[PDB]
Swiss-Prot record, chain B:
The keyword Hydrolase does not apply. It is found in: Nucleus; Chromosome, Centromere, Kinetochore. The gene is NKP2. It comes from Saccharomyces cerevisiae (strain ATCC 204508 / S288c). Component of the kinetochore, a multiprotein complex that assembles on centromeric DNA and attaches chromosomes to spindle microtubules, mediating chromosome segregation and sister chromatid segregation during meiosis and mitosis. Component of the inner kinetochore constitutive centromere-associated network (CCAN), which serves as a structural platform for outer kinetochore assembly. One of its GO terms (biological process) is meiotic cell cycle. GO terms for cellular component: kinetochore; Mis6-Sim4 complex; nucleus. This is Inner kinetochore subunit NKP2. Present with 1630 molecules/cell in log phase SD medium. The chain holds residues 3 to 103 of 153 of the full protein.
Curated annotation (Swiss-Prot), chain D:
This is Inner kinetochore subunit IML3. Present with 125 molecules/cell in log phase SD medium. Keywords: Cell cycle, Cell division, Centromere, Chromosome, Kinetochore, Meiosis, Mitosis, Nucleus. The gene is IML3. It is found in: Nucleus; Chromosome, Centromere, Kinetochore. It comes from the Eukaryota. The keyword Ribosomal protein does not apply. GO terms for biological process: ascospore formation; attachment of spindle microtubules to kinetochore; cell division; establishment of meiotic sister chromatid cohesion; establishment of mitotic sister chromatid cohesion; maintenance of meiotic sister chromatid cohesion; meiotic sister chromatid segregation; protein localization to chromosome, centromeric region. It comes from Saccharomyces cerevisiae (strain ATCC 204508 / S288c).
From Swiss-Prot, chain E:
It is found in: Nucleus; Chromosome, Centromere, Kinetochore. Residues 133-147 are annotated as: CTF19-MCM21 binding motif. This is Inner kinetochore subunit OKP1. It comes from Saccharomyces cerevisiae (strain ATCC 204508 / S288c). Present with 2688 molecules/cell in log phase SD medium. The chain holds residues 161 to 334 of 406 of the full protein.
From Swiss-Prot, chain F:
Residues 60-118 form a coiled coil. The gene is AME1. Present with 1630 molecules/cell in log phase SD medium. The lineage of its organism: Eukaryota, Fungi, Dikarya, Ascomycota, Saccharomycotina. Component of the kinetochore, a multiprotein complex that assembles on centromeric DNA and attaches chromosomes to spindle microtubules, mediating chromosome segregation and sister chromatid segregation during meiosis and mitosis. Component of the inner kinetochore COMA complex, which connects centromere-associated proteins and the outer kinetochore. COMA interacts with other inner kinetochore proteins to form the inner kinetochore constitutive centromere-associated network (CCAN), which serves as a structural platform for outer kinetochore assembly. It is found in: Nucleus; Chromosome, Centromere, Kinetochore. It comes from Saccharomyces cerevisiae (strain ATCC 204508 / S288c). This is Inner kinetochore subunit AME1.
Length: 117, 90, 106, 241, 147, 118, 371
């Protein structure tokens, strides 16, 4: 439930802000100020095609497409499990006794449906 | 999936841009840059791998919730048949 | 606020439906209503009455009659100065044209 | 799409004279052929009260537009009470100036012709009798669509139509027998026999054929320009007293 | 053109918070009111150049409005995407049920044909082969005699 | 290029202020680099904000087009669901199904009667 | 995502004003009482305020401003109640279209539904596709069930046209409002799936031409004695000609005798005073086009009828195609016969008005409908 919003939030709150601010300007612990400033400006300037708000949108779309392709095999496998006497095979009264509180008992329909299982 | 995300996080980094242009101390200056930049991605690789774990586990526990509501068990059916047996006995 | 809803509906209807200088002469000669903006004229006549006053009140129909009479006097003086303007071979009027008609009437 | 309006003519007149006055008033030239045609050229007519003199006053102009193109088909007979009439199409002003000239020069009386019900039945009978060059009358057929438009209380029954397909029409005609009048001897007795709706008394509006003609109560709409001889013969027979 | 001053003031507030985040880290040499009035001294000094930027100085487009618009667009997109996922699952289940019912009908047709062919080999000579007018007279006489 | 012109003007003002702070930055040592840290954060936030405004606009147009395509596919899947369930309800209650059901019941009754009569 | 009654949509206020201005004051009082009892907003203290307002003889405008500005749309359930009461009030605005309910071999299936458990089943079937809200009440005069099915869309929630499905109480014919969009097919298919619960039901439509009111479609195709006779056989649908065997024999039509007129069978109509004979002729026309004895309109007004008469003379299939139009067809036909334009001796039964609102062909003297 709501997987694409979680993907986009994870990207925009764990990669982009983490690689734009701290990976660029907080790397001055080893230092002069001018050299780390100029190399931060250089790595910021020669990067303006991957950290855009469109390329990460396409990346989240590709992530969702890959997870949907993975989800397809899982949905086909979990629908092709042991049937365990599934629905659309019993009568009305059997599934009504399964779901509880039928509010209308009728012995003739119980008889005509108990021979169908 | 993970192969896209790791390639994306390893592409946009300092190690692919600064070391292209790389005298006695400055060679040792960016030598410590390559280890610290490899340190933060290793703390990042654990989070994105745990993110794919907590996604598919929450996904498959959702998929088994919708499937079992549209399937049947071998206990509630026997309980309903016990009730039907009691009614026909009466 | 049904009056507010009716006013918004009429404003939407006006915004959707209702929304070589020779045309304006024949256009504004068949118009009947007033042509001076109302509440700045009311503020102006309030400032004029402050010279010869005391909190003197004002009925709205009196200011309407004043606006009508002032517009009538202004278009009368302007129609009379147009003839003296074209008489002096001036299609474009001037302040000298609205000096003789302001002089010879009194 | 040539809507043929119809007007009446009081007195019998010749058209070879006075046409130069129309040319002088019009500054055009028109051709007026004199066709002494005769209905059912089969010899069971007696050659008496069967012939007419037709004056197709064409306007040989540029035919780029059909609404300005207007013929004037005439008819006449020197034996009946009302001898002559005409019929005009188009939306030209030349129709008005030529009816002005016809009212002014010869001194005649013009009035529009309103249609009956049996007149419309005979026109639908006559508008399908085709004349060939081999002196015989071959009859084509059309999927006719009759029409009615009566007036009732609170507009109960607005308008209702009787549509007969082509093969059914040919079957009724071949089952009635050999005659030159299908739509007054076969179909209308069949509709009266199977429905009880006498179409002679019901209010007709538009006897419409299968795209061929469209007979109305005030005009006739066709697909081709020309009008047949029996059609104008039935129209001239209808306006007698 | 006041939106530029508003965006500059919001960016100044965010940069002031970000600088306080680093001044809390570099306060090892400095205790509570020592760096308090010092940052307050640069608070008006940053406001001085901000006021001088108005002396130094088209559309009106903010950042938070278009950010919330993008958030609403992405939320609606995720909602419609999950709806398409649910409808894809529903269409898959109904396609499975359709193919199941069609193969059941074809299996019953082939089983009926096989049963007819094995009954044609089977032996029913006296009591069955006179009809194998049959069931209609029974229903007639049954609803007549109230059988 | 009005946003780019505002970016260039703010970047020039920030570059002049940062050059002045750097020339002034030759216990006041923490007070020296503090102002250039302010100007660094201001310049980076302003440039990133303008580039992000442009990127948010173009990604909003992109997401609008993709959302229109997603809504079209949703309408198509709705039509497919309705057609499939209609085919199911027409096949499960068809005349041929009931005819073969009655013929199978008659064949089962006939083979049971023939077995017990034999 | 099945919307409950407490959700409010986003609709224009002035169209709800225009709709609620088409109702009397006492139904507005009942609506205010029921809505305040169920939802409320802005006990019996606020009831006497309207009790004193309706006693003073106020207009409908101040009370409709009261109801639209103590709740300020109201909700989905209030809109459903407003529209359904508007349906009860003026029935001439809508347009119904009937459809039969077949199952199995082709035998018709009576619905016999219950209003309680059907509604949640229909809603939980519809909620897996769209946003939906259903509402079902009983007509106060006629024994039918009218169900208002409303749907929504997301560009907050843009409303759709409300779709009505009218269930009669004990008939296999189910009326629905005339639509042909994919939502109409979705709602009808969902009802056809959820009404069954034991064995599958399909909805083959029995007619293609819509009919106007709910009284008319109930008298035509619901559970009624007029369901098949409908024409010159309207006397058998009311039995005004015979009495019970326990009645008197002195007042019997065998003993008293009815005044009749000698029919004519020769072709004596195409060649064309005594007011008793005129009254008997009008009585003959009343007999042929109606039952025994305004004054031209039939029991049911029929909008559109298209016949087809495929006779057979000397092994030739001769078809004609009658078509009709107007407000009430057979009433206007009786009026045209009343002016002595149609010979009533040769008016067949299918033209006379029987099997009303059924446009079908005729193959050798017996009517059959069209699919």
């Amino acid at each position: 439930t709501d997987t694409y919003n979680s993907i986009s939030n994870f990207i925009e709150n764990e990669l982009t802000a983490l690689l734009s601010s701290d990976d660029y300007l907080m790397d001055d612990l080893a230092g002069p100020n001018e050299v780390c400033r100029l190399l931060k400006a250089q790595v910021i300037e020669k990067r303006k095609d991957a950290m855009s708000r469109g390329k990460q949108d396409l990346l989240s779309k590709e992530i969702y497409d890959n997870e949907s392709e993975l989800r397809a095999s899982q949905s086909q496998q979990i629908m092709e499990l042991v049937g365990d006497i599934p629905k659309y095979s019993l009568g009305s009264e059997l599934r009504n006794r399964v779901e509880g509180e039928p509010q209308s008992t009728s012995i003739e329909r119980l008889i005509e449906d108990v021979l169908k299982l | 999936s993970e192969q896209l995300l790791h390639n994306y996080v390893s592409d946009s980094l300092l190690t692919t841009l600064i070391s292209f242009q790389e005298e006695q101390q400055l060679q040792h200056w960016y030598e410590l840059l390559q280890a610290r930049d490899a340190r933060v991605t290793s703390e990042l690789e654990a989070r994105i791998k745990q993110f794919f774990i907590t996604l598919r586990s929450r996904l498959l526990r959702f998929l088994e919730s919708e499937q079992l509501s549209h399937s049947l068990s071998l206990e509630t059916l026997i309980d309903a048949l016990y009730k039907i047996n009691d009614l026909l006995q009466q | 606020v049904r009056q507010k809803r009716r006013e918004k509906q009429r404003k939407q209807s006006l915004k959707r439906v209702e929304k070589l200088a020779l045309y304006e002469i024949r256009k504004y000669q068949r118009s009947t209503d007033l042509l001076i903006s109302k509440i700045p004229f009311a503020r102006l006549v309030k400032e004029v009455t402050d010279e010869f006053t005391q909190d003197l009140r004002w009925q709205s129909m009196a200011i309407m009659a004043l606006q009508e009479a002032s517009e009538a006097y202004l278009v009368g003086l302007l129609e009379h100065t147009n003839l003296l303007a074209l008489h002096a071979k001036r299609i474009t009027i001037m302040k000298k044209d609205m000096q003789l008609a302001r002089r010879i009437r009194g | 799409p040539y809507t043929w309006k119809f007007l009446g003519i009081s007195k019998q007149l010749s058209l070879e004279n006075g046409i130069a006055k129309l040319n002088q008033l019009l500054n055009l030239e028109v051709d007026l052929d004199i066709q002494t045609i005769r209905v059912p050229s089969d010899p069971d007519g007696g050659t008496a009260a069967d012939e007419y003199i037709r004056y197709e006053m064409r306007l040989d102009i540029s035919n780029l537009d059909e609404g300005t193109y207007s013929k004037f088909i005439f008819l006449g007979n020197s034996k009946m009470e009302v001898p002559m009439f005409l019929c005009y199409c188009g939306t030209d002003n030349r129709n008005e100036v030529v009816l002005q000239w016809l009212k002014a020069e010869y001194g005649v009386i013009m009035w529009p012709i309103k249609f009956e019900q049996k007149t419309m039945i005979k026109l639908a009978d006559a508008s399908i009798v085709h004349v060939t060059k081999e002196n015989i009358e071959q009859i084509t057929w059309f999927s006719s669509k009759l029409y009615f438009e009566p007036e009732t209380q609170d507009k109960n029954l607005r308008q209702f139509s009787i549509e007969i397909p082509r093969e059914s029409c040919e079957g009724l005609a071949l089952g009635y027998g050999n005659t030159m009048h299908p739509y007054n001897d076969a179909i209308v007795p069949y509709i009266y026999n199977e429905t009880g709706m006498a179409v002679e008394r019901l209010p007709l509006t538009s006897v419409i054929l299968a795209g061929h003609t469209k007979i109305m109560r005030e005009s006739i709409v066709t697909s081709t320009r020309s009008l047949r001889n029996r059609v104008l013969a039935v129209v001239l027979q209808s306006i007698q007293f | 053109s006041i939106l530029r001053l508003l965006e500059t003031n919001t960016v100044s507030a965010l940069d002031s918070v970000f600088e306080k985040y680093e001044k809390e880290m570099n306060q090892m040499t400095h205790n509570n009111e020592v760096k308090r009035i010092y940052s307050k001294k640069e608070r008006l000094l940053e406001i001085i150049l901000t006021k001088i930027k108005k002396k130094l100085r088209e559309r009106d487009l903010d950042i938070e409005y278009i950010y919330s618009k993008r958030q609403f667009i992405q939320n609606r997109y995720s909602q419609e995407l999950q709806n398409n996922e649910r409808l894809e699952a529903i269409l898959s289940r109904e396609q499975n049920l359709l193919e199941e019912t069609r193969k059941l009908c074809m299996n019953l047709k082939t089983n009926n044909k096989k049963r007819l062919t094995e009954k044609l080999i089977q032996k029913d000579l006296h009591p069955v082969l006179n009809k194998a007018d049959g069931p209609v007279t029974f229903r007639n006489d049954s609803h007549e005699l109230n059988l | 290029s009005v946003t780019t012109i505002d970016v260039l003007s703010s970047l020039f003002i920030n570059l002049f202020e940062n050059d002045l702070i750097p020339q002034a930055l030759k216990f006041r040592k923490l007070l020296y680099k503090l102002d250039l840290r302010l100007f660094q954060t201001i310049s980076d936030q302003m440039t990133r904000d303008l580039k992000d405004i442009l990127d948010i606009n173009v990604s909003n147009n992109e997401l609008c087009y993709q959302l229109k395509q997603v809504l079209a596919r949703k309408e198509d899947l709705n039509q497919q669901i309705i057609s499939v369930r209609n085919e199911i309800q027409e096949l499960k209650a068809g005349k041929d199904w009931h005819d073969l059901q009655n013929e199978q019941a008659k064949l089962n009754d006939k083979v049971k009667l023939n077995k017990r009569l034999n | 995502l099945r919307l409950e009654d407490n959700y409010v949509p986003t609709s224009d206020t002035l169209v709800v004003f225009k709709q609620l201005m088409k109702l009397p004051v006492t139904v507005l009082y009942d609506l205010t009482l029921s809505w305040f009892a169920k939802f409320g907003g802005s006990i019996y203290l606020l009831t006497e305020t309207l009790d004193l307002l309706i006693e003073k003889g106020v207009r409908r405008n101040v009370i409709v401003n009261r109801i639209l500005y103590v709740y300020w749309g109201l909700n989905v359930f209030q809109l459903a109640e407003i529209d359904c009461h508007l349906m009860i009030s003026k029935p001439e605005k809508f347009k119904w279209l009937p459809s039969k309910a077949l199952r199995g071999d082709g035998k018709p299936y009576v619905v016999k539904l219950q209003p309680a458990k059907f509604i949640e089943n229909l809603q939980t079937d519809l909620a897996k596709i769209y946003h939906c809200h259903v509402y079902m009440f009983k007509h106060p005069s006629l024994p039918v069930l009218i169900t208002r099915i409303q749907l929504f869309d997301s560009n907050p929630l843009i409303s759709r046209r409300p779709y009505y499905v009218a269930f009669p109480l004990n008939s296999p014919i189910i009326f629905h409002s005339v639509d042909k969009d994919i939502y109409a097919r979705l709602v009808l298919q969902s009802i056809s799936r959820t009404i069954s619960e034991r064995e599958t039901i399909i909805f083959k439509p029995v007619q293609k031409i819509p009919v106007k009111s709910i009284h008319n479609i109930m008298t035509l195709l619901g559970p009624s004695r007029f369901a098949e006779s409908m024409g010159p056989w309207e006397c058998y649908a009311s039995a005004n000609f015979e009495r019970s065997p326990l009645h008197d024999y002195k007042k019997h039509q065998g003993l008293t005798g009815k005044k009749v007129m000698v029919r004519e069978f020769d072709d004596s109509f195409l060649n064309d005073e005594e007011p008793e004979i005129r009254r008997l002729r009008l009585e003959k026309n009343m007999i042929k086009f109606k039952g025994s004895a305004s004054r031209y309109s039939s029991l049911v007004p029929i909008e559109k009828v298209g016949f087809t008469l495929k006779n057979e003379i000397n092994s030739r299939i001769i078809t004609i195609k009658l078509k009709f139009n107007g407000n009430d067809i057979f009433g206007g036909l009786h009026e045209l016969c009343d002016k002595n334009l149609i010979n009533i001796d040769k008016v067949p039964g299918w033209l006379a008005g029987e099997n009303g609102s059924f446009s079908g062909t005729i193959m050798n003297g017996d009517f059959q409908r069209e699919q």
